Amino acid sequence: GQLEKPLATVGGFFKMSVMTGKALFTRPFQWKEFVLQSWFLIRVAFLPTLAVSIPLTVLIIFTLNILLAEFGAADVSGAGAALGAVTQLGPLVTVLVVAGAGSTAICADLGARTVREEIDALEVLGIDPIERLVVPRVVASTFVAFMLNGAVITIGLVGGFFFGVYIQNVSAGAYVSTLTLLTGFPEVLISVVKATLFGMIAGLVGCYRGLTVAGGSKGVGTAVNETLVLCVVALFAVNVVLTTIGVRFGTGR
């Protein structure tokens, strides 16, 4: 009985996601809502994404450079600079600035629609919310996560190059020539898969929590907080699983 309580919400989320997939592959797509939600997520989670990605990659590059300079092998730093940035820094900054901003925004928007009885207004008009609202939001979440992951990886690599060369006086040719030493097609492919899955899961969780808001006076805030916590936990677990799968393939081996 103790496990049966969260299992009901788990089943509701899973059934809602199954219906979302069915509406995506069966019913006509909502291009207008998809465009609107894509631009909304981009405008709500682009500047924070850079503002979190730039200092974090600078910190990682600084730590790697000092540790390797003491180690003596300061010419292979770019290798690590690539290896983290493609496979962990990109998807994890995507996790943070998607779950914090876009997932919470989707949950708040759908909760606002629910408490204002707009969902019931759609439902009494014969329309299905899962096809008109959830599908464009999940697709927009996936698209924005993909693009943001690409931008994060690129900006992180460039910032690491500039910091290491112009501050810690490492050699630029060693940075650019060692980037591909440990990173190849498997790493960028697993990064793309991570970003796509993270965006899809964040969109699904945000939509499901927004549709099932409790109203009241703290229901929307509680729903947003629960959305954020669930997204962080689920995306970290999925990142662990996908990291294991990706290192099973490997560029070095």
Partner 1 sequence: CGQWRGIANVPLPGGPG
Partner 2 sequence: RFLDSMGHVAWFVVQAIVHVPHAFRHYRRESLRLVAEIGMGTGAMAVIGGTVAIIGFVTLSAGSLIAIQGFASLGNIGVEAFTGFFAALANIRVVAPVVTGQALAATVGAGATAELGAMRISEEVDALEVMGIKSISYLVSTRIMAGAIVIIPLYAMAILLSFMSAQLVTTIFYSQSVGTYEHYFHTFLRVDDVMWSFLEVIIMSVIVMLNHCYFGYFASGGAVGVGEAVGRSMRTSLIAIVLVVLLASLALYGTDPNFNLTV
Partner 3 sequence: SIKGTLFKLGIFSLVLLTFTALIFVVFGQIRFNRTTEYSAIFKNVSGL
Tell me which residues touch partner 3 (CB under 8 A).
32, 35-36, 38-39, 42, 82, 86, 143, 146-151, 153-154, 179-180, 183-185, 187-188, 192
Q: For partner 2, which stretch binds (CB under 8 A), given 23-31, 32-40, 126-134, 215-223?
A: 215-223
Closest distance of CB 19 from partner 2, Å: 24
Residues between 127 and 186 with contacts to partner 1, criterion CB under 8 A: 165-166, 172-173, 176-177, 179-180
How far from chain centre, in Å, is Cα 107?
A: 15
184 binds, among partner 3, partner 2, partner 1, none (CB under 5 to 8 A by kind): partner 3
DSSP symbols for 11-24? HHHHHHHHHHHHHH
209 close to 107: Cβ distance less than 8 angstroms: yes
Choice from 10, 11, 22, 63 touching partner 2 (CB under 8 A) = 63
Q: For partner 2, which stretch binds (CB under 8 A), given 27-35, 46-54, 148-156, 190-198?
A: 46-54
Q: Which two tokens stand for residue 252?
A: 């070095």
35 binds, among partner 2, partner 1, partner 3, none (CB under 5 to 8 A by kind): partner 3
Neighbours of 106 (CB within 10 A): 31
173 vs 216 by CB, closer to partner 1:
173
Phi and psi at 37, nearest 5°, equal -70, -35
150 binds, among partner 2, partner 3, partner 1, none (CB under 5 to 8 A by kind): partner 3
99 vs 170 by CB, closer to partner 1:
170
153 vs 228 by CB, closer to partner 2:
228
CB neighbour burial string for 34-70, b if at least 16 within 10 angstroms, e if fewer: beebbebbbebbbeebbebbbebbbebbeebbeebee
Closest distance of CB 41 from partner 3, Å: 10
Burial of 185 (C-beta count, 10 Å sphere; 0-12/13-18/19+)? exposed
170 close to 77: Cβ distance less than 8 angstroms: yes
Contacts of 115 (CB under 8 A, 6+ apart): 213, 215, 219, 220
- Sites of contact with partner 1 (CB under 8 A): 165-166, 172-173, 176-177, 179-180
